[PDB]
Each structure stands twice: as structure tokens, then as C-alpha cells.
Design a protein around this ligand. Sequence first.
Ligand SMILES: COc1cc(NC(=O)CCl)cc(OC)c1
Lengths: 237, 300
Amino acid sequence: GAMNSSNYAELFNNDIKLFVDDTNVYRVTVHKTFEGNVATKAINGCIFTLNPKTGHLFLKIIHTSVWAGQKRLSQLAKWKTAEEVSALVRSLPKEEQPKQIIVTRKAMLDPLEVHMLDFPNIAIRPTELRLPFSAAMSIDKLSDVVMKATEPQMVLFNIYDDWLDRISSYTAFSRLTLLLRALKTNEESAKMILLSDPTITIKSYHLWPSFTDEQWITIESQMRDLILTEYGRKYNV
Amino acid sequence: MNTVPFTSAPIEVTIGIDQYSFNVKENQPFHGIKDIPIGHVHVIHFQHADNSSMRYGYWFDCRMGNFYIQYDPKDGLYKMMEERDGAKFENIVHNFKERQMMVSYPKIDEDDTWYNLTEFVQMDKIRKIVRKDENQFSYVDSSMTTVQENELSDPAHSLNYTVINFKSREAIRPGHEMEDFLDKSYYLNTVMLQGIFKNSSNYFGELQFAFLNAMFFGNYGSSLQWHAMIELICSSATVPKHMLDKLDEILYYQIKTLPEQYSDILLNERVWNICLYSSFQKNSLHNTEKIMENKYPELL
Ligand SMILES: COc1cc(NC(=O)CCl)cc(OC)c1
């Protein structure tokens, strides 16, 4: 059934599972036409498919050409997402295929269920947590590869960099979610925190800066303050 | 006009014949039902006064044999049986008529209700849904589960309706996932009509039989099957014009006949609102939409 605050710890067990977030698949800018009507222009998007135990991210880039001449794009986007996730599963060796796929939005359930009929033993689950994977395009290297794509492409990342050498997947996921929750609430301030100190760099093969354990504690705390700050600015508390 | 005699009525019971019903008191001198129209299937059904649990009954066609009812005190129910000795049967019936111990099938001449509810229902098809090949008539009751219900337990007492499942490989062509899920025409027209039912008459017959078992016995799996068969048509963008017009008539008479006080349990809100207001056929069921809006506007 649904993953929630009671059973979220199943994320860090040894049954392979993937999260699928479709919130950045169909992206548009809305603008005025010369006649003063409104129109959309699509921009490149991505499926965010993540193993929370290992950090492996399967970033499928959605090039704007997939929308050409299609109608009802917001509906199509969910079915395209499910088509690509099914193709990914089929591409993986049997022992790497997931036992469960958790979708972050319930509107993905039927599209993914239908595309996965050939995989009756893979459980398709919703979740009651309102997670922040929409902010994935606030990670500079992920946004850069999406915008630069000129054709459909799959790019593989580890979204935890090398953190699992020092912390557990529970703690690593805790660190990733906190970072994403803050880029989503105040991207400018969040990125200021992450790069304020020019002596801490991002390795070429990494997504986040190379903080020591003690600096991550400081960073974590500054992210805990920002979220709360913005919460007060929003609600006036 | 045919007759179904009763040996006796040893326990108090409400007896139905098609859409009619009457109460018989314990050991009342009741010996059956006469003047039954030839040309239709019929159903004779029972609810005991002392245990309204288990409505049960028998589907039959008097053209296929001489049938009568006899109470069994061991199994505790009214059983249908076939009499093979034709002169024994005629002599039993004629005697019971001369003593006027029979109720008359009370059909109004203007009235086409039963025809309209059973237009496509055939005994031969009923006997394939309800498997008991040594009898010419078919027993159904409130508790019997369907093949599909058993998949999700005694197979000999099951209703073998055609399984319909919108998220199934049968329903969804590889490579047309979105197309086939959002527009079920290929599942309706190729898989079900051309492949399984062979023609729309047989599809309508099973739909009508499922409705009647839902209404007369409160059979829950039959209600599921009736709604699934409606939904499969309404969710198809491409449906022969003759089937849509006939479906509108079929449903009209079903909604008209439904007890006003059973609507809460025999009508699925989601299916009906989707079918009448959201589906491809939202504008093709004028008679059914009009009676539903005037008779059950709460559900909508
Ligand atoms: C709600 O999903 C979660 C959230 C967190 N932590 C945070 O969101 C800290 Cl901002 C951690 C977790 O599993 C370790 C599951």
C-alpha cells in the first residue's frame, strides 16, 4: 500500500526499489502572442528515477521534440513517463530490476501499472509523504545536462556523491531531502549557503560540495534555519 | 401458455415469478403458477419468511421441458424438477387448474417490461454461465460468487461470467498502452465482440442476465459484471450506432424496473456519473439519462 511516516524506513532495506517523480517531465514557459493571446513553449524536461538505498539516479532527459504535434500534453506526460520507466526496467538485468516502484504523485499509478503488466510481481505504490524531488532541477549539473540535450538521453548519477562511505543510506537520504526541501523553499538562499565559502569545491565527478563531517553539520543547520525562516516569512510567525 | 405446478407449500415463503411476487402462508393450498408466456426465459424465485437470508431461484424456459417445484425438507428449499412423463404432468396440471389452486401470471396486455428486460437472454447462454448440465433449468442465489471474484471458492457453484478487467494484458495491446486504456474500443470490438461473444446480441444477453441476478437475488458479483459491461461500452469511442441505441433502451428498462429503495446498493455512483457525463457516450444515452435524472438525481 502507500508509503507513509509509519513505514518510510523500508527505503533503507535490501529489496531493490525506485522512486519515480514526474514533476519535471513536461515543462513550459507561458507567454503572450503577438495577437495578445497566451501560448506555451515547452522546454526540456526529465524523469527523476532514484534508488534511495544506493543513490543511483536514472535521469531520463525528455527532449521537447517528443511533444511535437501531440495533444493533451499533461496527460501524455504521465504515459510517456510510464513508458520510459518500463523501458528502463526491461533494460536492467533481472537481479537489478526493482521489486517495488514508488510514484511521488498518485496520477502516475494507472499509467505505470498499465505499462508494467508484463511485470506482475513488481509492486506499484503511492506515497503520503509530500517529498521535494521537484527541486532536482535546482542542482546545477542536472539542470545543465537537461537544458543542453538535443535528443532523448539517459544520464546516470549518484545523487549522494561519496556520502555512503561515511554515513548510512538512512542518514544520506535525510541529508538529500533536507537539501532539496530548502532549494525548493528559497533556491537563492540555499545556493548561497552551499557555495558561500570559496574554499569548498564540487568535485568534477560530484553534484554537491566536498564538505567535511563537521561542515555538513553546519550546512545542515543553516538549511534547518532557512526552511524555518521562510516558513515564518510565509505565514508571518 | 405454460404452467409450473407446485407439489405443495409447506413453509411460508414469498414467491417471485419474473417481476411479480406474492406471499404464500405456511401450508397454504397453493399448487403453482399458470398462464406463463411462451417465448421468453423466466425466473421463479424464493425468500423464506423465517430466514430472508438467501434469496434463491431458477431460470427456465417452458419450451425445453415440463418443470415443477417441490419442497425438500432435508435441504430446506423449494427445488425445481423436470417431469419426463408428459401425460402424468398434463394430468397433474389439469387437475390443479380445475380446483383453481394456481395463481395466474399477471401480465398486462399493454406491458412489454419482461420482454424488454430479457430481449437478448437465451437459456443456452444461461446454462454456460451456470454450469449444471444434467438439468435444463439453472439455479442462482444471493451468495454465489463469480469466476472473477474467485480469482481475487467452490468452482461448481460459480457464475462463469465473461471476465472483464481494464488493467489486463487482454485489454491492453503492447505498444498502445495509453490509447487502449483511455479508449477501450479495441477491447470492446475486437477482443470481446468479435472474439469472445461473436455478436452484440450475446453481449447484451449476458449484461441483461447479470442485471436480473443482481436485482432479484442481490447477487453482488452479478452487479459488478453488469456495471463492467456498461462501462466497457461507454469507455469506447467507437461503438456501432445500433449497439448504442439498443443499450439506451436496455438500460432505460432496467432503471425503470429497479425498486426505488434498492438504488443505494444496486447502482455504482462512479460508473453511472462517468458513463452519463464524462465518457465518450455521454451524449448517446438520452432515454437512460432522462430516467436516471428524474428517478435517482441524488446518485448524480
Ligand atoms: C519524508 O521523507 C523522509 C524525510 C527525511 N528527512 C527530511 O525530509 C529532513 Cl528535511 C528522511 C527520510 O528518511 C530518512 C524520509
